Structure 1
Amino acid sequence: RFLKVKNWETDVVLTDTLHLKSTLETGCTEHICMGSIMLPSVATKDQLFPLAKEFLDQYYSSIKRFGSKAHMDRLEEVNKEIESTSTYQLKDTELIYGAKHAWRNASRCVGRIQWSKLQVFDARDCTTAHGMFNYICNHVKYATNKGNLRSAITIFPQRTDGKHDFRVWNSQLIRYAGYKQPDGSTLGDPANVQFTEICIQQGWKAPRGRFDVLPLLLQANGNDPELFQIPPELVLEVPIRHPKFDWFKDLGLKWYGLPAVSNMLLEIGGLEFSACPFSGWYMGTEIGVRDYCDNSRYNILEEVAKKMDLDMRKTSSLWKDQALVEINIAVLYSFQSDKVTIVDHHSATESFIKHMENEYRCRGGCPADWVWIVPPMSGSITPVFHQEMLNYRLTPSFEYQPDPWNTHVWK
């Protein structure tokens, strides 16, 4: 009931009691484990006060004023507003606390050592998609900070009825376009081929190339979404060159500096923020391994093996592995030489072990998804591979949510 997690590289053990505060369900049962299932499984007023109370209790606990006068009054105050409105509004302080802890609780995030350094942009006074575009542009410019990337989150108005939803239809604020081809293949990013087509459906004029930044599709107050182009001076990009292979430039690769997830749902005190784009900085492997070498993404192991002079006939020549490493030395070196913040998977996973230590000490645990924390290359030479991790669902949290075009009642 007060479980132990072991590290099998250092023999360090830590005791988790934080999982006791866990509320939501994981997908696993006593007889089945779903730890590798990617996305395992209107809100009313009865359900809403426990969530408000549970959240307010931990917020007031956090400012070292649990159960004080200000707490019990805000408790009463929010209850009265859940009577009056069948919902309620967060204080600016509560919104920042909730957002920061939604990140802190993100068990799939290897970057949470930074969780308390999050810039929260309150966009709950937004009303149109144009306002969203403007808030998002300010977010992009801020979080980029000329390459000295700064983590940030912009929080659009909370869901009310359900048919009035603020949504960023993009899965990330900055993604490259994906166009299928007349010969059945794909240019750009195959992940975004549907979304690239939805933008064309809503009128986007596509410069059908590779690294064509997509336009924002922003839905405000449940209205049909509208297209907006992020001013290209706001989209910082890193040309990928290798520090050894001067044929790397001829590959002609580049990636954007700002990883900014825009399709998830922020839950705070039972309130649901359907549009809450949030950004940090990249870990090299996200670009160099997944974005570039996933079979259904850019799929570049092909050419990088070629220009390196590698035996590609035999599977066991590990030509794939060898070209994969050069690609990630190149992503890293390109970002570093440009002063664009990036972290390598060794430094990032070392910090997460350190972060885990701090969480178990001053918090009693750290929910963690091994399947997602372990980097997608060189897993066992990073320390998180050898670290047992308990996964559980704390709130405030970031949740997945349906793609908007599957759910939206158009017009």
Structure 2
Amino acid sequence: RFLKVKNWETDVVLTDTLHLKSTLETGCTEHICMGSIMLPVRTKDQLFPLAKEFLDQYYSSIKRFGSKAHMDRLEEVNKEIESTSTYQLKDTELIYGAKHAWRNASRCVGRIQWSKLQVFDARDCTTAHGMFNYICNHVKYATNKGNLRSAITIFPQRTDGKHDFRVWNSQLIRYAGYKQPDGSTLGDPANVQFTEICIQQGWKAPRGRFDVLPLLLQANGNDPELFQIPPELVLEVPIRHPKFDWFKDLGLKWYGLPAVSNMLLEIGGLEFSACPFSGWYMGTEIGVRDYCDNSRYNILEEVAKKMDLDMRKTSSLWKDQALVEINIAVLYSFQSDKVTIVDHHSATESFIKHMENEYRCRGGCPADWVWIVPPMSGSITPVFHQEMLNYRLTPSFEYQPDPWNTHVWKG
């Protein structure tokens, strides 16, 4: 069955067939849509099928479907599964898998870059210190002195679920958050719980507004260990405004490398629980969400005062005016320091081209409108006017429970 999506600003209509290759569920039903809900070990029995589907997808991609190599590989994997209850991916398959998990990530607006992902194979890693070393190398490679390069580091896959590798941080680089006894929060409120865990594990917190958190790494199911990322490897950008000189006085800054590190990467049934990946920021992530969310740094009021805006009534749109300025500042500061970053207009325009290309060459592009449309100026970006279909393809990136909720402490 064919499904069509229309762009209401350009009348361009596209046909989606790729959704037929989707077997996973969305969370919605014929009677209800859960499109705005944030969060809507395997056995041989179930592993064989998943491996085959994947290998079939892989061999078709290299134009070797049905070849001897394809058949030999399928036989080899099946023997290995029956013989060990699992199987190891070849390097080529891992790279293909990682790239496609990105290509299939419906919430990511930066997918036009999917094929250029640098994949670091850390499957030979066995200890927390080893993990730290791999992570430091990823950060330095990806940061590339400001000329950011997309990358992902893949640690050993899950086996019995009791020997998991996990990066307890939600992002490799992030600022600590501290709940004060007067009820206020110093730093980033989003990371208060994790910061408390770090302190308990022994981290000596400098209790500032922008303290880079330490890495809390778990290897082979052991208790996590603390490590400090070499400061020389953490690139930060002081935020200033091109017209307002008092902006710099707000004492704001952010890190240049966004590296999600708490997701699970699934490839051919295999589960990679520690797979930190990084790209580069879209301005609004920082300027709109990290700085202006009421539950994050929440700087709107202060910026509004400095601008001497009429804050007596919302209809003055003081919040909106300030939001724009803060976002102009974030983009300007990053550009001035030559640290890669993309504004939402540029990012969304590129996503539309990528999407159309994907329909034509792949038969579709699963996309989550709720996440794709920028958190500011929605309708003045092309994606707002673009109908999208959301469905789950594999390989894929999945959410997983925070480790502190499930880890069996060994002492």
> What band does the TM-score fall into relative to the shorter chain?
over 0.9
C-alpha separation between the residues in 2 aligned to 1:364 and 1:98?
Answer: 19
Q: What's the CA shift string for 1:282-315, capped at 9, x where partnerless?
A: 0000000000000000000011101111011111
Q: What's the CA shift string for 1:1-31, capped at 9, x where partnerless?
A: 2100000011100000000001100000000
Structure-1 residue corresponding to 2:314 = 315
Pairwise CA distance, 1:338: 0.7
Structure-2 residue corresponding to 1:235 = 234
1:403 aligns with 2:409: no
Q: What's the CA shift string for 1:308-359, capped at 9, x where partnerless?
A: 1101111111100000000001000100111100000000000000000110
Pairwise CA distance, 1:234: 0.5
Pairwise CA distance, 1:64: 1.1
1:6 aligns with 2:10: no
C-alpha separation between the residues in 1 aligned to 2:33 and 2:111?
Answer: 25
Q: What's the CA shift string for 1:147-193, capped at 9, x where partnerless?
A: 00000000000000001000000000000000011211001000000
C-alpha separation between the residues in 2 aligned to 1:383 and 1:51?
Answer: 36
C-alpha separation between the residues in 2 aligned to 1:263 and 1:231?
Answer: 21
Pairwise CA distance, 1:46: 0.8
C-alpha separation between the residues in 2 aligned to 1:67 and 1:336?
Answer: 49
Pairwise CA distance, 1:257: 0.4
**TM-score, length-scaled by structure 2:** 0.99
Task: Give unpaired runs (5+ residues) of structure 2.
Answer: none
C-alpha separation between the residues in 2 aligned to 1:55 and 1:64?
Answer: 14
Structure-2 residue corresponding to 1:192 = 191
C-alpha separation between the residues in 1 aligned to 2:13 and 2:321?
Answer: 35
Structure-1 residue corresponding to 2:368 = 369
C-alpha separation between the residues in 1 aligned to 2:375 and 2:43?
Answer: 41
Identity percentage over the alignment?
100
Q: What's the CA shift string for 1:181-210, capped at 9, x where partnerless?
A: 121100100000000000001000000001
C-alpha separation between the residues in 2 aligned to 1:346 and 1:66?
Answer: 40
Structure-2 residue corresponding to 1:292 = 291
Pairwise CA distance, 1:397: 0.1
1:342 alignment partner, SS class: coil
Pairwise CA distance, 1:265: 0.1
Pairwise CA distance, 1:67: 1.2
C-alpha separation between the residues in 1 aligned to 2:210 and 2:346?
Answer: 28
2:134 alignment partner, SS class: helix
C-alpha separation between the residues in 2 aligned to 1:294 and 1:129?
Answer: 34
**TM-score, length-scaled by structure 1:** 0.99
Pairwise CA distance, 1:65: 1.0
Q: What's the CA shift string for 1:255-276, capped at 9, x where partnerless?
A: 0000000000000000000000
Two-structure CA RMSD over aligned residues (Å): 0.5
1:158 alignment partner, SS class: coil
C-alpha separation between the residues in 2 aligned to 1:7 and 1:298?
Answer: 35
2:115 alignment partner, SS class: coil
Q: What's the CA shift string for 1:76-121, capped at 9, x where partnerless?
A: 1100100110100000000000000000000000000000000000
C-alpha separation between the residues in 1 aligned to 2:315 and 2:229?
Answer: 45
C-alpha separation between the residues in 2 aligned to 1:309 and 1:64?
Answer: 63
1:149-228 to 2 correspondence within 5 Å? 149-228=148-227
C-alpha separation between the residues in 2 aligned to 1:313 and 1:218?
Answer: 48
C-alpha separation between the residues in 1 aligned to 2:294 and 2:174?
Answer: 18
C-alpha separation between the residues in 1 aligned to 2:237 and 2:264?
Answer: 29
C-alpha separation between the residues in 2 aligned to 1:22 and 1:170?
Answer: 31
1:272 aligns with 2:271: yes
Pairwise CA distance, 1:122: 0.3
1:266 alignment partner, SS class: strand
Task: Give unpaired runs (5+ residues) of structure 1.
Answer: none
C-alpha separation between the residues in 2 aligned to 1:298 and 1:2?
Answer: 45
1:232-271 to 2 correspondence within 5 Å? 232-271=231-270
C-alpha separation between the residues in 1 aligned to 2:11 and 2:333?
Answer: 36
C-alpha separation between the residues in 2 aligned to 1:315 and 1:341?
Answer: 34
Pairwise CA distance, 1:221: 0.2
Q: What's the CA shift string for 1:22-59, capped at 9, x where partnerless?
A: 1100000000000000011x110110011000000010
2:152 alignment partner, SS class: strand
C-alpha separation between the residues in 2 aligned to 1:45 and 1:291?
Answer: 43
C-alpha separation between the residues in 2 aligned to 1:212 and 1:9?
Answer: 44
C-alpha separation between the residues in 1 aligned to 2:10 and 2:333?
Answer: 33
Structure 1 residue ranges (4+ consecutive) displaced by more than 3 angstroms after TM superposition:
none
